[PDB]
Amino acid sequence: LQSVGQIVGEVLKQLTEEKFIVKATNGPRYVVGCRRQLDKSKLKPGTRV
């Protein structure tokens, strides 16, 4: 009950080491940062997130 669920989208681009252009499915697109502990190397464009 403490989980809130999450959007799902596809990473479009790596704007910089922190800013990721990410498109939500059937919705708008954002620039969003990643979690503090994550494998940015595996955040290739097109990777569903």
Partner 1 sequence: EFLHAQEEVKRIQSIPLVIGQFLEAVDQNTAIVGSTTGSNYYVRILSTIDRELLKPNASVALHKHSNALV
Partner 2 sequence: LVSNVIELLDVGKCAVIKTSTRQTYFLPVIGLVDAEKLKPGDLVGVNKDSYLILETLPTEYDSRVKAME
Exposure of 43 in the CB half-sphere (CA atoms within 13 A): 22
If one asks whether residue 30 binds partner 1 (CB under 8 A), the answer comes out as: yes
Q: State the Cα–Cα distance between residues 4 and 47, nearest whole angstrom.
A: 22
User: In the set 19, 38, 40, 47, which binds partner 1 (CB under 8 A)?
Assistant: 19
For the bound state, the minimum distance from the C-beta of residue 33 to partner 1, rounded and expressed in Å, comes to 5
If one asks whether residue 1 binds partner 2 (CB under 8 A), the answer comes out as: yes
Q: Which secondary-structure segment (H or E) carries 34?
A: none
Residues of this chain that interact with partner 2 (CB under 8 A) are 1, 3-8, 24-27
